[PDB]
Amino acid sequence: GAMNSSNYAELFNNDIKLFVDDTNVYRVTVHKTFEGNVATKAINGCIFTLNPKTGHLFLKIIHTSVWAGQKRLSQLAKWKTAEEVSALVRSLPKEEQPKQIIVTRKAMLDPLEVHMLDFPNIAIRPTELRLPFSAAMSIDKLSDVVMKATEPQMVLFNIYDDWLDRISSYTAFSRLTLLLRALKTNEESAKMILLSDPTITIKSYHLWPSFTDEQWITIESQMRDLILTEYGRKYNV
Amino acid sequence: MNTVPFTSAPIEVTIGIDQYSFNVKENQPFHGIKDIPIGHVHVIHFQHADNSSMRYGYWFDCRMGNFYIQYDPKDGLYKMMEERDGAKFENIVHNFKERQMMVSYPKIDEDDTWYNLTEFVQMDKIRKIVRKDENQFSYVDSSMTTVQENELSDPAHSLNYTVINFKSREAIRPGHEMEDFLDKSYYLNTVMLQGIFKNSSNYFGELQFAFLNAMFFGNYGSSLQWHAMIELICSSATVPKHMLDKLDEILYYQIKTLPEQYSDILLNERVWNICLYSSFQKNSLHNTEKIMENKYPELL
Numbered sequence: 001g002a003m004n005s006s007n008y009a010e011l012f013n014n015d016i017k018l019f020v021d022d023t024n025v026y027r028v029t030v031h032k033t034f035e036g037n038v039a040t041k042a043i044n045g046c047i048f049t050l051n052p053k054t055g056h057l058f059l060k061i062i063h064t065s066v067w068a069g070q071k072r073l074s075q076l077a078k079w080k081t082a083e084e085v086s087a088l089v090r091s092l093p094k095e096e097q098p099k100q101i102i103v104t105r106k107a108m109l110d111p112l113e114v115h116m117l118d119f120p121n122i123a124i125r126p127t128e129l130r131l132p133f134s135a136a137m138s139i140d141k142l143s144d145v146v147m148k149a150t151e152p153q154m155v156l157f158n159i160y161d162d163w164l165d166r167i168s169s170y171t172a173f174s175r176l177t178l179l180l181r182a183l184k185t186n187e188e189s190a191k192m193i194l195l196s197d198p199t200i201t202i203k204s205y206h207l208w209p210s211f212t213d214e215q216w217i218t219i220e221s222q223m224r225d226l227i228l229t230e231y232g233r234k235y236n237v
Numbered sequence: 238m239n240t241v242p243f244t245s246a247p248i249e250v251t252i253g254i255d256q257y258s259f260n261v262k263e264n265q266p267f268h269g270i271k272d273i274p275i276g277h278v279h280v281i282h283f284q285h286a287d288n289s290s291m292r293y294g295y296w297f298d299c300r301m302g303n304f305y306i307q308y309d310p311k312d313g314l315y316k317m318m319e320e321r322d323g324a325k326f327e328n329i330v331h332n333f334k335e336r337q338m339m340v341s342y343p344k345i346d347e348d349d350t351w352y353n354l355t356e357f358v359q360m361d362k363i364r365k366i367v368r369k370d371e372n373q374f375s376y377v378d379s380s381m382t383t384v385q386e387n388e389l390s391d392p393a394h395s396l397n398y399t400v401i402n403f404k405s406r407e408a409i410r411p412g413h414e415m416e417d418f419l420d421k422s423y424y425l426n427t428v429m430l431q432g433i434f435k436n437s438s439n440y441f442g443e444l445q446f447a448f449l450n451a452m453f454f455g456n457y458g459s460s461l462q463w464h465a466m467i468e469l470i471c472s473s474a475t476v477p478k479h480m481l482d483k484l485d486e487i488l489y490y491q492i493k494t495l496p497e498q499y500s501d502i503l504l505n506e507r508v509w510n511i512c513l514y515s516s517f518q519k520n521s522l523h524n525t526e527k528i529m530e531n532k533y534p535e536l537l
């Protein structure tokens with residue numbers, strides 16, 4: 001059910017829509033056992049649910065206890081995601097419920113369709129573009145609240161901080177995807193770009209530094225440089 | 238044995254009677270079909286020599302009345318009719334037999350194919366899928382659409398099969414989303430078997446009737462119905478042993494009887510690979526899997 005760039009504009013219109021990313025829902029470390037076999041240990045995950053227009057992020061924290069005594073966890077994760085998303089929709093006032101939900105992976109179409117049977121007018125469709133939402137765990141404040149969680153927890157963020165006071169949603173989401181793409185390609189260097197100048201800080205209620213318009217241009221350029229490089233490093237070009 | 242006489246054959250047409258068929262030439266002196274085995278439903282079906290468009294035909298049971306065929310030159314097709322005058326009908330049949338203008342239903346005494354394809358099919362049920370209550374027989378043709386097809390335009394000429402949809406509230410219990418979608422046993426046994434069909438014989442009868450309309454008329458909606466009903470059983474982890482064993486027999490003969498030349502349009506590759514190789518019942522259709530592999534290994 002995936003479209004082309006043609007309507008990058010459908011994103012930022014006035015129809016309420018949410019992006020659902022399940023990459024970080026089911027997360028493991030793989031290790032050797034005393035007997036020299038391999039075992040996984042689960043760590044906390046999250047559902048990344050984002051309104052691209054408003055920047056609102058509904059970060060559903062998935063505690064490791066949800067997997068206890070369950071089989072086929074990677075398949076269960078997709079259904080747990082669909083259940084949480086449906087619960088979120090049901091918890092919103094009607095006028096705030098999305099008209100459509102965009103899954104970033106095609107394996108979520110059926111778990112979500114089934115959980116949303118009660119909402120026939122909410123269109124479920126997947127991307128066939130490449131969105132970097134899996135890098136949301138590279139954002140320090142987001143990573144921190146997931147790892148510290150002792151129980152299931154829903155934490156609300158604005159992933160655009162205050163940008164919308166100054167730029168459009170279109171630009172705001174292009175900056176976010178460029179920041180996330182950079183973080184995904186070379187986290188260390190991306191984080192170096194963002195903090196090298198200690199005079200530019202991160203407000204306690206923000207996720208990203210308080211760059212001026214001028215400083216955002218420079219930053220965005222450095223992130224583009226980064227991605228282009230890593231592309232060279234990787235492919236030898 | 239019973240008889241379906243023909244008033245005449247004014248236009249050239251290939252006539253089918255169950256899985257048998259013979260060519261009749263424009264105004265050849267053809268007057269019907271005799272020795273039709275009592276105890277089974279049957280289908281007499283037609284493809285005009287001049288317009289292969291619209292295969293069409295009639296489901297009937299000779300125990301339910303005296304039936305004849307009459308070409309209608311206004312509507313342009315062979316029409317089944319009932320003769321209520323019993324004395325008149327015996328009279329007509331005896332004269333046509335005496336003049337030997339009837340073909341004999343050519344059953345081979347060792348052959349159980351028709352029974353094996355119509356085991357669970359009953360006229361009373363056919364007449365509920367094909368609603369035209371003034372007639373004791375039922376008309377079907379290539380183009381008739383199903384109730385589910387019209388939902389996604391004339392309901393008088395629809396095929397009223399049981400709607401099956403794996404992503405519906407009917408199929409999916411609130412709170413059991415993942416469970417009921419990956420193991421459809423609830424949907425099969427409680428919703429459909431216990432709720433709608435009442436027993437497995439009525440389920441298999443619709444199954445077989447859907448297959449037969451798909452094959453004899455290339456009715457696409459019927460084909461969709463046949464595949465759906467197989468997939469529901471095969472995707473159910475919990476099915477009565479007797480249902481599994483019968484289903485293997487049902488499907489084996491359907492596969493056995495299917496014209497090879499039609500295998501590319503009437504068999505859904507996805508459903509069959511799923512049923513035979515990925516589903517809960519992957520190991521429970523030995524006969525059906527052996528003939529699918531030996532006859533159509535290309536689909537798989």
Ligand SMILES: O=C(O)C1(c2ccc(Cl)cc2)CCC1
Nearest residue numbers: 003004005010011127128129
């Ligand atoms: O083309 C795509 O995949 C993207 C998309 C997704 C949903 C809508 Cl409504 C419109 C554009 C563009 C970012 C993902």
